[PDB]
Structures are given as structure tokens and as C-alpha cells.
Design a protein around this nucleic acid. Structure first.
Lengths: 209, 56, 127, 71, 114, 123
RNA sequence: GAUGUCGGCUCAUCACAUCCUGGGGCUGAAGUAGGUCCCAAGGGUAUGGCUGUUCGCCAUUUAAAGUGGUACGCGAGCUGGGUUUAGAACGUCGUGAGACAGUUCGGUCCCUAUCUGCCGUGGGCGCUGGAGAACUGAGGGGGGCUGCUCCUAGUACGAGAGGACCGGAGUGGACGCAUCACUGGUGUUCGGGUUGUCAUGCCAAUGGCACUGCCCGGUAGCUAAAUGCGGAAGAGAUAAGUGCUGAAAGCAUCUAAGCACGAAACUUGCCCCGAGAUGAGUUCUCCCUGACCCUUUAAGGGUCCUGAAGGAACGUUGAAGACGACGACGUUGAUAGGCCGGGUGUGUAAGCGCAGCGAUGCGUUGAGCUAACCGGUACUAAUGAACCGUGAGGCUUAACCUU
RNA sequence: AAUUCCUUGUCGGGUAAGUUCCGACCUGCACGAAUGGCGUAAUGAUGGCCAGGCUGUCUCCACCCGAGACUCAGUGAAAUU
RNA sequence: CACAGGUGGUCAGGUAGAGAAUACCAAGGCGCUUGAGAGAACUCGGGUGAAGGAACUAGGCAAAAUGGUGCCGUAACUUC
RNA sequence: GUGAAGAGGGAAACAACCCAGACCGCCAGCUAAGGUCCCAAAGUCAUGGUUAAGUGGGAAACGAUGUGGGAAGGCCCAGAC
RNA sequence: AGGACCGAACCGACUAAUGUUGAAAAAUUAGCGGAUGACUUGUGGCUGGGGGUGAAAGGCCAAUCAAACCGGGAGAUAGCU
RNA sequence: CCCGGCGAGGGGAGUGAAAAAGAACCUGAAACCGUGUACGUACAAGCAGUGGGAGCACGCUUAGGCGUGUGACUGCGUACC
């Protein structure tokens, strides 16, 4: 059940014994570091907090430094937590890795961040250029009529025109594990791992499919 | 679009409320000169952490 | 778009970019001290230093290369002669930028560039 | 009266159901019985903000021990 | 990113060059097409410099006839069976276009020219 | 192939010159297919030495594209021009028993066991 | 004193009397199939051509090619094609001026958004001493579609041919999200080649400029044409409907009391935004324990002493993005630039050997040059501080504290 | 057919296929001999159709550079009311 | 208006190039002033484009679609 | 009649309806049309009949053993329906 | 040689992209056509509003033309707003 | 006499009856743009008004909701021609 925070690190086209070779994305999932671990009075639900990230920890807010001090030491400004129905671990670090991802042969790679900024590039808010009749001019890509009238529903909810990509955390839901690899902790996931290259992510397991 | 009446002077005051440009605080001294500067930045005509700056 | 890349591109097409760096590196080689915008001051570090590096030891092909990057008789004479053997005892940082303040002609962020063994100044002032 | 709202759809319109309200804490049935009994906009809101209800028969938000009342 | 750019050096095998493309060589490959496996071979000259980005591949130009047939074989996979080295030559540039419209009585190159 | 109103080269023993895409297959709401697709052709030209005549409509599959087909190593073998071997529009497999010019890798699977088995080409 | 049109493009949106899968009655329904047929807003609901075109005519995709509304949707969107648009003039008619929704030739369409909405985004304030950290779900949407064949199953039935679903499975097609290794694209911060003229005194050699002069390759990035891939087992409340037990009506009976089963929708399970949720929030971790004068005093004003934890400007700057915010982080420093080791690109750097009676090429040199990338290096530049934040922080019931 | 109430006429042909084009035909608008007719080389920035070269006009758009947008600084309108 | 608009006479230097196209250039003019930075949608110019090659559209949609000079080689029709 | 040419009460409101006719003042009473669980001023009124449908508080054709009362009547504890 | 052609300077503006509260009351970039001819065109001169002038569109008369302007009649008149 | 750049513009000092007469100078609205005080704006909204008003400065309010100026909040309520 437990969500393991990875790092986007590597991309490889690996061969398979058939006449096709496969592009794959390579995720280092090592040092998932507990410092809290919640229980079922602590916000009322039992869950496990793990930390994977990059911080010097010399010039660090004292309320944060003591959070790490009384239990497992960690780096990383942000920390992530996950509900479960399994046995909970000791709060001074557990560092559990890629091995979790062989007891299921699918993962949900969930992300942290999103890495494109706007995605007006026919990705998240899409377009078709005006197909040219009679000598079209000025507008080709600004939406023609976003509303309707005051009886269909003026301008309806759930429409974008311009803005931001969001920088939230995005699923592709239930994507395959290609391999798990001990002795250097490599996860082969087949693709669509979110964010720009070198960005952080979350990778939890598949509960749906 | 055009409008439908003349707007208010309370509006004019509202639209410029969240625009006006910021500043550092407190009249600075420096470790190496009696010169004031913009803080955490090079003294424009004197010493701040050795050397002088600026020309023309 | 700018992702997983570091460096600055100004508001010029490439033929002008070549001309402006050949103007400014000649101005550095004549005046020994410059002031310019913070984006230029970076591109001024990245233009001059790979030329200093080439220029530590005496090499006729690397002189041809420096004249390929910036066309000037002043610059290829200063490097490998005065500034080359000067910057020979280093492994980088052959110059330093000091963050001088805001422009005085109109308005843009400026940084001063000043060779790593130098600490001279001059001015234009009438007060 | 199944309290339809605009919230973005296709083919139809998406709605809250009466049925949702019971499954997500017992309050909401009781809550849109006293809401709808108060006036206009602003006064009906100044009145409204004085009600609390929660999960009911189990809720901690009662620790005060107020004046007891049967109606 | 702490394992990429290292990973370009790792895939890289001892055949990958730093040369003027246009050695003849012979590419031995499988016929995996369908549900069966034999061999087949390919000869010509390789006109492009391999190992761009992470993985090497051979872009052979055949040059026996006037037709722009470029063929791409992945160097790092087992579908490519064996790799033999033959006669020397040079093209410099990754393109050889004047032979894709007429070429013949031609097959081999054995010096890098003068 | 990637579009229609698209002439491409014969590579069959049923027409001549060029032959004409009436539509691409393998998906709707799109007037463009990917590489490795199934085309529907009308024969634009024909000659008597080839088995069929003009304006008859048949099925076809790709045998060359100068973009390449993803089938052979994981690195697309990009053969010169767009070119197509005609199929039967119900009974399947090639109706033409030859190819003009060299052999291809596009004729070495299950659907092509009548054209490689011959001695005058792809042998 | 303007509710203003056809046609094409774009961009939508809602009503379900649903194009379709899905649960189900009937049939003059054996079964398959269809007719008959109800629930259903959940979701996919095709396109190119000619023509200014509705409607037409034609080829076609996909398992598939639905109905209705919207100032006959949308010129404070687009073109300005269409009617003699305004113009001949053909065809037509009248004595003519002038006309014609038959016609052919090209042919002037405005608004930078006040309030309002829609989506993205910051400032300031309540969060109850302050600070930082995780965080619950009051609330609300998204996946949601649909063929194929293996099994299910050649079986009930029918004369015989024949003969289906749910459930497991992979896979096509639609729909949508992310991605840059693969395959292409580009890469005005990287290499080489090349016409031409001008130039480095001149030559061997080499270079500014001509759209980045032109052309091909290109790190890292981004990207679709390429890539990876969801679309879910289960549960409850149910519709239409099979009913059981049972009253109106001595009983029967979907009915009134009463209960098993009964669909993608609905409540969910799966996913995502969320304490301004004033119902003002929990829980984890840090810090502050000095004093008098005065007035209204769950309070504030003045002053000495004195304010921590933290914050912000500032600063280099990003793999974060309209700006911001958010983020690494200021010598406790690998941020960016250089620079070293490496990577990956290009195609062997001037001189020399050798070919070429020359441009130039090839061996000396797998060279040289090189950008954003990976790790090292403090080489360089990010002042020592100040300032905002204070000395343990409301009444009252209930619980505990000598209470 | 610049000419046809009906009609996107009927049939053949090119063809993604092509109301238009090209050919034949008359079920012939109100065609029809200076409102001129028939045929014709050259010519027109003149219309439609055709096959081939090429190309971002387009399938379907990606990315680079620059000027506005956006950022900082400056000057400084308007429809309207 | 320091208006991308309009406007008569005389003179005629160099290389490459079909020439007073056009790149550079002798004599000369002259920086046609928002700047400078970022690199959102998007708007406009400019670059560049896989595979197809108008498939866009009533309509090829300016150059990037054609180009120059030398040489070989040449059709129905025609008032030649 | 009312608006036009008149305030107020009631109606989710209005030009026009119903009560009604604005002298002006009154923390006065009463009654109208309209109302009386909260919104919202007054009855969850005392007593009885009936609907299971938010009908009430949205309309006709139209039908039936959907349910009750009433007088006359057939059947009707001898057995109904 | 040529009221042949391709084409600058010199003159024009068929198309296409843009401009469309512009750079500019049609101009730009680029395709395009006249340029030895019914061409391009300077100076001086001349016709004045239903009047000129027009290889004719019912075009052109001071970046305006299917009807230029002012001083008087003049407080024109309007089964009218 | 002060600030500034050779400047612009103003003050202080002194003139005068007056500069709240400082050179556009008479006294001086209203449009016009900004300061200063009092009280107000973060469960908060609409012809911005009327009715009711905590609260704050000043009036012993004769404290019994008042005068004066404002005002959390809210019942009620559609501009003028």
C-alpha cells in the first residue's frame, strides 16, 4: 500500500528478445526516510510519512530541525505521507526501496510537480488552427465563442483559454513495472513519469488495476 | 468594450493599491565604510567586502 | 521554453550577437574595466574565458580560433601576450563580476566586470 | 427538489443527490432543513452562523455543556 | 539527475568509433519477421557517425544502385547478430546524396582519399 | 499513407506507374495514419502485363516509406519513397507476385509466403 | 436614437422522447435475430470532395455515424464568399429612367472589457501567544465509451441448417493525460562544409557580412508525426422488472404494513482540488518565564531593560513558472559563470609528413574545437547586520491542577 | 453556355470525389442571326478543370529568433459617460 | 508630424552577377531613437521542417512554390 | 372599475387584478382582499372523513373495483360481494 | 524593325500575406504588368457645380464626388419631430 | 537665508492694511487632484435611499435609545425626463 518518493534520474531503450526494442524510464527509489509515522489518533488515521529530497540541513528552521531530531534524520523541505492496512515501521528510518514493487507488477506513478509551465502546446489545453476559407485573418487560435447565450448557460464552468498548468500531482493510473533491480535500486517503468527531467516524484502502487 | 456611466474615484484608488514598488528598510551602515548602500548589495561608491564599483 | 538549460539569449539575432561581443571584448581589452547588464555580464564571462584558456600557451591555430569567434586585431594581440601569460596561473575565474546597481541611462540590472588582479576605478561625474 | 447546480457537464448536467448527504456525515439533511428556513441573503447568513450540528450523538463539539433544552 | 550522462558512457560498446564514416564493414542480423528465425546479412558503407545520445546504431547506405535506401540497425540489441570489419574509407559528412539518383559499377572503398 | 489524395509507387504485379489512396485505415476522427498502416487504393494507371485494370478498388499495406516502419530492430529502416504492395480486398495476401527494385524486410512475415517462395524475386 | 441575414471556419452548451453497451416485460419470440419495449444525463457521438449552399450528389472511416434548443447559438469571434450586395453586363423586361434571390468577373464588416461571468495568479486580513511541519474531509468534480476472438458454450432449443450473455483474458477503434529514451522535428549560446566579396600588409593559412548569407549534422531542452496508457474486482440504495408474504375486496396479489434479487447512472470502491469548514480546525515539532507610571480597562497608551523561534527585502539563481508566488540558496555556500575529469556532437584544428604541379584532402592527431548536461573544484561573486516578530498569551461551563 | 422555371438536368469521363470541369444529349427557359451569330492564330496580372515538379496553405503542429503581450522604467490616447 | 506615401533636370567609380535585379563596395549618405530583459497564451515578421504534396479552401496560401548563364534538344495548332 | 390622471394592503412581481381612495401627525385600535409550523404579523386550532401522490400547491380527452360518505334500490347473516 | 515580350531606374497596381482605435484617410514585403510607346512627363496656359471634363464607371473637380463653397433672400418651409 | 545643475519651483526672513494681495496676484463657487482628523470598511453585496441602531467625541439626554457629526448591523424599498 505505501507510497515511496522517487527521483526522475535516467531514460533507457532496453531490448527485448523479440524484433522490437522498448524506451523505458529509470527511477532511483532508495532512502524513503521516516521521522514521524502517524497513528489513529494522530489526525485520526494511521499512515506512514517518508522523506526523499535534497537539503544541506545547516540553515533550516528550528521547528523543522527538531521534527527530524527526535526521530530519524532526513533532508528535503517537503515530506509525503500514505495511508495503509499493513504493519507500521519504527520511526527512526527504514529506507525501503524497489522491492515493494514486485509484489504488484503495476505501479501508480503520481508525481509532485509538473515541469512544462503552461502546456498551450496541444497537451493540456488544446487547439485546432482555423482551416482557411475566403481569406481568413487575425484570429486562428483564440477560442471563437466560449459561451453560448443566457439560456444554454452564459459562459459554462470547466473551460480554460489561458492560464497555468497547475504544478499539482498527476496520475497516469496503473502503469506497468517492466523490472525491479536490487544492488543499485533501479525501477524500470515504461514511460509517462510526470514533471521535467531531474524533478522529484511520488511512486505508489496500483489499487485500481 | 465601452462603459455605461462615468466610474468612481474610489475605483482609481483601488486599482493602484497593489502595484506600487517596494524598498529595503532601515538606513544602512557597512562593515568597511561610513557609506550607506542598498543592504546585502555592493556600496555604489565605496567598500562593502573589499573593492569599489561603478563607472560613467 | 526554458527547462533543464542555463544561459541567457538577449533580444538580438545571431549576426548582431557576434557583433556586440566583438564590440564589447574589444572594449574590455582597451579599457580593462567594463559595466554592462547582468545578462550581458554573464555572456561576457562565457565569451572571454574560453579564449583566455586557449590563450595560456602559444598556439597559432587557437589564435585563428579566437579571431573566428571575434574579428579583431586588438584582441588577438592582447591574448597569448599580455593576458594569456597573466591568466596562465589559474584554472578559471580569470575575471570577477561585482553587482553594481541599476542602469543610469534609463533602467536595467547591471553588474560590473573587473579582472581578477585589478581593483581600479574611474568615473564620469561633474558634481 | 434534488438541488441541481452548474459545475460542468456534457450531455446532461452534473448534480448533488439527496442520497450523497447521509453517507458523508449525518449533518447535511438536518443542515438544509434549518438553512432554508431563514431570510434573504445577508440576515439569513448572520442567523445561520450560530448553528452547529456535526456527526450527531458522538461529536466532541459539545464539551461546553450548555443550557439543556427539549422542543 | 545523478545517474544520467554516466549512462551514455555505460551503454557504449568497444566497436563505437570516432572517425570519418565510410568503412565498408558487414552487418549480420536476424530474420525475426513472423514466428520464425533464420539469418540474413547486410553490406554497404556506413555514412553516418553512430552512438548519438544513449544508444549506437548502424545507418548503412548500400550504394550499389541509385535509390536512397538507408537502413538502421541497433548496435546494442541481440537482433543484430555479429559485427565484422572490412575495407577503409571516408565520407566525412553524415550524407551521400549524389548516389541516391545514379550510382553503379561501385561497391567498395579501400582508401580515405587524397 | 500519412495522408490521402496520395499517389505512391507500385511494388506489385497488378498495376503500373503510380496508384492512388482513396482513404487511409486504422482509425477514425483522423485523416492521417501512423507508419505500418493499411491503405485502400484505387489503381490510377494499370498496364496489361499486370493482372488488374484501372478504377478498380483494392486493399494494400506499406512495403516502403522514406520515414521507415517500426518492425525490424527498434530502429526504423527507412526505404526510399512511399511504395505499396496491393492485397486482396477480402481473400487477403498479395495479388502481385513480384517487387520492382531490391528486396525488403517488409515481405518476410506470415502474410508474404507466396511472393518470397518464388525464385524470380526475394530469393 | 438597431433583438442585424445566408454560407464556410472556430469555439461551445444544455433537454432525453438515447445512435450504442448495459438490467428487464412482451411477441402471431423455439433458439439465433428482429418487431414490440421501459429505465438511464453516465460516455464515445466521424470526414474529404464539388457548390457562397441549406438541402443535394458521391467516396469513405470506425462496432458506430443520433433527435431537439440556443437573438433560426457564436461579425463587443473570424473572413466578408453570398443577393444587380455598391458596378457593368449575359439572360430578361419597359419608350426610357430602372429592375430581377436565374447568372458570370473580383469586390471596404468596427470596440484594447466599466460592472457581470469563465479559467489561471498575487497582495491584505480572521485561524485566538507566535512560528514552522505534516494533515482530516464539511464540500465538489474526473475515469465513465465501444468492437474483436480464446474460454464461458456447439449446450438448453429446433425439422434441420444453426445456436447467445455475464464473468476472465489479451487487443483494435474512439476519448484523454503525461513523456523525450526510441523514431523524426527543432536546437540564432556546438562542429564542419560552401558560393561571393570585402578583409587580416601579402602568401601557405584564416575570418567579418549576405534571412542564423547558404546547406547537412548537433549537447541539453521541448515536441508529435513518436511514446507510455487509464477506462477497475467488489459493495449498497435502486429503476424497468421476476416476486415472496399480505390488506383494500374473508383471498390472491410489486402494496398498504413487510422482505430476497434487479444497470455503466446514483451511494461508493479508483482518481484529483479542498479549514474562509467564521462550524474559525486537529495533530507533530521549536521558542519566548523582565519592570513601573497612566486612562476607558476580557483593553490600550508612555518608558527603561529587551524580543527568541521565525519572516521578508536584498542576492546569485532554478530541472518552479505570465508576473509573481513556489523552490535550491549567500562562504555553515556546488546557485550560475569559468575550470578539471566524463559525457555526448562534429569529422581531423595552424604547422609537419604524404597525395594533389593549385583550391584542398588524408597520416602526424579517435585530433582540434564545444552550449545549456553528470560529478568535482570555492577559482569568482553573493556584507558583518539592521528591521517586522517580545518577556508565557480572554470571558465562561464542563474536566484536571492543593482547586 | 456569361443564357435553363424545374435541375446539385440525363448519361459517359477525369477523380479520395469533384454542384463546378471535359464530352455527348434534349425532357430546348423566354437561345437565334449587328441586344449580332458561328469558327480561328496571337493576346489577358482574366474565370474553371487536368496531370506532373515543389512547398507548413493543410493533415497535426513542434521548436528557434525577434517586435508587441509579459517585466522594469518613460510618455500617454479612445469608443464612451 | 523627423509621415514606410508622392515628386522634374544633370553626372555616372570597383568585383562577382542576365543589367542601373542583386551580395559586398570606391566617393558619400546614415543609425529612419522606446529601451533592456524574459521567451506565457497569442499577434505579426523571419528561420526551419518527417511522411504525404493542396490532401487546406469557394481560392496554391506573396519569397521560402519557380528562378540565373552556357550548352544540347524540341510538339498539335498558326494569319507563320 | 383600475392605469392613463392616486399613496397604501395582498400577489417571487407587474402598466392595467382584487380590497381600497394618498390633508397632515400618532411604538394606537379595528377590519378588508390576503394570511395564521419557520421564512413572515396571526391556528402544528377543537371535532370528524379520505388520498400515499409532494396529489395538494400544473390542464383536458379518458378509463377502471384506487378510497370514503349520502338518500332511493337489487343482493343482503336463509350466506351476500 | 515591331501600339511582340521579361524587366529595373521611371510609371502603374491583377493576386497573395499583413495593416484594419494603422507606420500610412491602400501603404508594405513578394509574386506582377507598361517602359521605344495610344508610353513616361516637367514648365507655362485654359473650361467653375446639375457646370465643366470623361478610350464612359452615370468616373474626376485641393489623401473627399451619384452632385465643391461663401455673402444675401432667410427666423426658407415642413397634412412634422 | 535654505534646497538645486548652470535650472525649475516653493518656504523661512523682511514689505504691506492685506500675500488665507507673491506676481495666472481683485473676493471667489462648482468641476478638478491630493492631505489631515473623527468615526467606518476582512460572514462580507443590489438606484446607495428611507425607517430602526450597538458603538465613538462633544451636550449631567432630566441614561431610558435623544441633540449634533458619524456609524458595525439590519427591516423596507425599482433613477429623473
Amino acid at each position: 500500500m505505501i507510497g515511496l518518493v522517487g527521483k526522475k534520474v535516467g531514460m533507457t531503450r532496453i531490448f527485448t528478445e523479440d524484433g522490437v526494442s522498448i524506451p523505458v524510464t529509470v527511477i532511483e527509489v532508495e532512502a524513503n526516510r521516516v521521522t514521524q509515522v502517524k497513528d489513529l489518533a494522530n489526525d485520526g488515521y494511521r499512515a506512514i510519512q517518508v522523506t526523499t529530497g535534497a537539503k544541506k540541513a545547516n540553515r533550516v528552521t528550528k521547528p523543522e530541525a527538531g521534527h527530524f531530531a527526535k526521530a530519524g534524520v532526513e533532508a528535503g523541505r517537503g515530506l509525503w505521507e500514505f495511508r495503509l492496512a499493513e504493519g507500521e515501521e519504527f520511526t527512526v528510518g527504514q529506507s525501503i526501496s524497489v522491492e515493494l514493487f514486485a509484489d504488484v507488477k503495476k505501479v501508480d506513478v503520481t508525481g509532485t510537480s509538473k515541469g512544462k509551465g503552461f502546456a498551450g502546446t496541444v497537451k493540456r489545453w488544446n487547439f485546432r488552427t482555423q482551416d482557411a476559407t475566403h481569406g481568413n485573418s487575425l484570429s486562428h487560435r483564440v477560442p471563437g465563442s466560449i459561451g453560448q447565450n443566457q439560456t444554454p448557460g452564459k459562459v459554462f464552468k470547466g473551460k480554460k483559454m489561458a492560464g497555468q498548468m497547475g504544478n499539482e500531482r498527476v496520475t497516469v493510473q496503473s502503469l506497468d513495472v517492466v523490472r525491479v533491480d536490487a544492488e543499485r535500486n533501479l525501477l524500470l517503468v515504461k514511460g509517462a513519469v510526470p514533471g521535467a527531467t531531474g524533478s522529484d516524484l511520488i511512486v505508489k502502487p496500483a489499487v485500481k488495476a | 468594450a465601452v462603459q455605461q456611466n462615468k466610474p468612481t474615484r474610489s475605483k482609481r484608488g483601488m486599482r493602484r493599491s497593489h502595484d506600487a514598488l517596494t524598498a529595503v528598510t532601515s538606513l544602512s551602515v557597512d562593515k568597511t565604510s561610513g557609506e550607506k548602500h542598498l543592504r546585502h548589495h555592493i556600496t555604489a561608491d565605496g567598500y562593502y567586502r573589499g573593492r569599489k564599483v561603478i563607472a560613467k | 521554453m526554458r527547462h533543464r538549460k542555463s544561459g541567457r539569449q538577449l533580444n538580438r539575432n545571431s549576426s548582431h550577437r557576434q557583433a556586440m561581443f566583438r564590440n564589447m571584448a574589444g572594449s574590455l581589452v582597451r579599457h580593462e574595466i567594463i559595466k554592462t547588464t547582468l545578462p550581458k555580464a554573464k555572456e561576457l564571462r562565457r565569451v572571454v574565458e574560453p579564449l583566455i584558456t586557449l590563450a595560456k600557451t602559444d598556439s597559432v591555430a587557437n589564435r585563428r580560433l579566437a579571431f573566428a569567434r571575434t574579428r579583431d586585431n586588438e584582441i588577438v594581440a592582447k591574448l597569448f601576450n599580455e593576458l594569456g601569460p597573466r591568466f596562465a596561473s589559474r584554472a578559471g575565474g580569470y575575471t570577477r563580476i561585482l553587482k553594481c546597481g541599476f542602469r543610469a541611462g534609463d533602467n536595467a540590472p547591471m553588474a560590473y566586470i573587473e579582472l581578477v588582479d585589478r581593483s581600479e576605478k574611474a568615473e564620469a561625474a561633474a558634481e | 427538489k434534488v438541488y441541481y447546480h452548474h459545475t460542468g457537464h456534457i450531455g446532461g448536467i452534473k448534480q448533488a443527490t439527496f442520497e450523497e448527504m447521509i453517507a458523508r456525515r449525518p449533518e447535511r439533511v438536518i443542515e438544509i432543513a434549518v438553512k432554508g428556513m431563514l431570510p434573504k441573503g445577508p440576515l439569513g447568513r448572520a442567523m445561520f452562523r450560530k448553528l452547529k450540528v456535526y456527526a450527531g450523538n458522538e461529536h466532541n463539539h459539545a464539551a461546553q455543556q450548555p443550557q439543556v433544552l427539549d422542543i | 539527475s545523478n545517474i544520467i550522462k554516466q549512462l551514455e558512457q555505460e551503454q557504449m560498446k568497444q566497436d563505437v568509433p570516432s572517425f570519418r564514416p565510410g568503412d565498408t564493414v558487414e552487418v549480420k542480423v536476424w530474420v525475426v519477421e513472423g514466428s520464425k528465425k533464420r539469418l540474413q546479412a547486410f553490406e554497404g558503407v556506413v555514412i553516418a557517425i553512430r552512438n548519438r545520445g544513449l544508444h549506437s546504431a548502424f545507418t548503412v547506405r548500400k550504394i550499389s544502385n541509385g535509390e536512397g535506401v538507408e537502413r538502421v540497425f541497433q548496435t546494442h540489441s541481440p537482433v543484430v547478430d555479429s559485427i565484422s570489419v572490412k575495407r577503409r574509407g571516408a565520407v566525412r559528412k553524415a550524407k551521400l546524396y549524389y548516389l541516391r539518383e545514379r550510382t553503379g559499377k561501385a561497391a567498395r572503398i579501400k582508401e580515405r582519399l587524397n | 499513407m500519412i495522408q490521402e489524395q496520395t499517389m505512391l509507387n507500385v511494388a506489385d504485379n497488378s498495376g503500373a506507374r503510380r496508384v492512388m489512396c482513396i482513404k487511409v485505415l486504422g482509425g477514425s476522427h483522423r485523416r492521417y495514419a501512423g507508419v505500418g498502416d493499411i491503405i485502400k487504393i484505387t489503381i490510377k494507371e494499370a498496364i496489361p502485363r499486370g493482372k488488374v485494370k484501372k478504377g478498380d478498388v483494392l486493399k494494400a499495406v506499406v512495403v516502403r516509406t522514406k520515414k521507415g516502419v517500426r518492425r525490424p530492430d527498434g530502429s526504423v529502416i527507412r526505404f526510399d519513397g512511399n511504395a505499396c504492395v496491393l492485397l486482396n480486398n477480402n481473400s487477403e495476401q498479395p495479388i502481385g507476385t513480384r517487387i520492382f527494385g531490391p528486396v525488403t524486410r517488409e515481405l518476410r512475415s506470415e502474410k508474404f509466403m507466396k511472393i518470397i517462395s518464388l525464385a524470380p524475386e526475394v530469393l
